[PDB]
């Protein structure tokens, strides 16, 4: 009489990692578990543990793995999930490292708002008067911020990388007593750049 031999996984992703993009839609298949059994037993597949059961579901008869709720690289860049396979006599499990792939899905957020500054009408051309800052949590180009005025002002410029605002033309209180400028902070994602607006009030004094 032959004793039962338990099944074993054959996927090579168990020896490295499984990469899943954070923009993967819920319901989508992300891979298929594969296993073998020396008794040729029909196998049933599942997900096992808390974090795994949270994000993944498994078709029990095929081993297709599918996304039960959305991933978010900004929250969790990688994690470990345990899958099971059973020949109805015993259950074995194995862990896989999930690497969560990034896409640009946040716009920048400004720091230290509201933005307002009072400056004298005789502020010389070239004078830095204000610094805007915004951050963005996406990877790479999608996380690197550029600043601009929308539209550009003939009286003020903002450094595209540093957010430093300077006077570029002589001021005149009697002509303009205050400027309401829109600052745009954009990321630099190639295909889907995202951006955010803040107001900057510049009040000219006497």
């Amino acid at each position: 009489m032959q004793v039962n031999r338990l099944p074993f996984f054959t996927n090579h992703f168990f020896d490295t990692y499984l990469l899943i993009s954070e923009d993967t839609p819920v319901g989508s298949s992300v891979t298929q578990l594969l296993a073998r059994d020396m008794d040729n037993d029909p196998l049933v597949f599942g997900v096992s543990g808390e974090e795994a059961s949270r994000f993944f579901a498994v078709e029990p008869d095929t081993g297709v793995v599918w996304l039960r709720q959305p991933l978010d690289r900004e929250t969790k860049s990688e994690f470990t999930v345990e899958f099971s396979v059973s020949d109805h006599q015993g259950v074995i499990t194995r862990k896989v490292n999930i690497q969560v792939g990034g896409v640009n899905d946040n716009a920048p957020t400004f720091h230290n708002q509201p933005y307002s500054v009072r400056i004298p009408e005789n502020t010389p051309v070239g004078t830095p008067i204000f610094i805007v800052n915004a951050t963005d949590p996406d990877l790479g180009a999608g996380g690197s911020v550029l600043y601009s005025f929308q539209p550009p002002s003939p009286f003020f410029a903002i450094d595209s990388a540093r957010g430093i605002v300077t006077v570029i033309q002589e001021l005149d209180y009697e002509v303009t007593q205050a400027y309401q400028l829109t600052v745009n902070a954009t990321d630099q994602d190639k295909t889907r750049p995202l951006s955010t607006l803040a107001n900057l009030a510049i009040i000219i004094t006497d």
Binding site: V3, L6, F8, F14, D15, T16, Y17, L19, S21, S77, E78, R94, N97, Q99, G101, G102, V103, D138, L139, G140, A141, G142, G143, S144, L146, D159, S160, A161, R162, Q188, K190
Partner: protein, 237 residues
């Protein structure tokens, strides 16, 4: 005229499509100088006499990574040590940032590199004790489990991950005690529990030397590792 100057912003962006992170796998215990990333594929020229970018490493915990800015290549730095995935070191991955500063406009882009370290079968099964023992009564029925001393990490363990670290137990023929592998059996190799297979006779034979070999479950049969112990079984009257 708007966006005429956008060429100025190209340096430091990826010179490839695809996702922003650069992810690679390398074997644990790879030799110093092993290539981690052959080419970061970042637009621009670092170093040389007229660079358009500056490249440097950030969050390089324990300095595992070395950068060559001219070639945009990343290497393993492991002189005087080893990149060990197994306990006690437990290095499963290394994550670093390649900071890129664009010299012309001063923007900074961070290119994340994630290195997943893969397990090698570089450890053999190790027994907790140098030898094992069991006492069995002569009237013990055939089919009775007479030794369970490999339970709960008291037998062989293996510090690798996955099947590399899973153990199977088998009894071997003992040329110095030929009937021992006929009198005892390990029917379930995963537990290594030993069961009586033939009726004992105290008037005939009072001691058995059972040779037990533990092997790990590496996918490649030629990479499997084995270790051997002896179970001495003494009869009581």
């Amino acid at each position: 005229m708007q966006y005429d100057d956008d060429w100025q912003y190209e340096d430091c962006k990826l010179a490839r499509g695809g996702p922003p992170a650069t992810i690679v796998a390398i074997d644990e215990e790879s030799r110093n100088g092993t290539i981690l990333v052959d080419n970061m594929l970042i637009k621009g020229t670092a170093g040389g006499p007229d660079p358009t970018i500056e490249l440097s490493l950030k969050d390089n915990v324990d300095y595992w990574v070395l950068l060559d800015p001219v070639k945009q290549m990343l290497f393993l730095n492991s002189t005087g040590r080893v990149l060990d995935r197994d306990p006690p070191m437990n290095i499963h991955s290394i994550v670093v940032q390649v900071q890129c500063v664009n010299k012309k406009v001063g923007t900074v882009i961070y290119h994340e590199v994630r290195i997943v370290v893969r397990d090698r079968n570089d450890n053999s099964p190790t027994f907790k004790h140098e030898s094992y023992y069991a006492t069995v009564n002569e009237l013990t029925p055939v089919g009775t489990t007479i030794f369970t001393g490999f339970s709960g990490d008291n037998g062989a363990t293996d510090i690798d991950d996955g099947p590399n670290g899973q153990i199977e137990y088998v009894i071997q023929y003992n040329p110095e005690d030929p009937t021992s592998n006929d009198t005892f059996e390990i029917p379930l190799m995963l537990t290594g529990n030993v069961v009586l297979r033939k009726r004992l006779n105290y008037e005939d034979k009072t001691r058995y030397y059972v040779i037990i070999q533990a092997n790990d479950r590496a996918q490649n049969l030629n990479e499997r590792r084995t270790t051997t112990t002896t179970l001495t079984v003494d009869l009581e009257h």
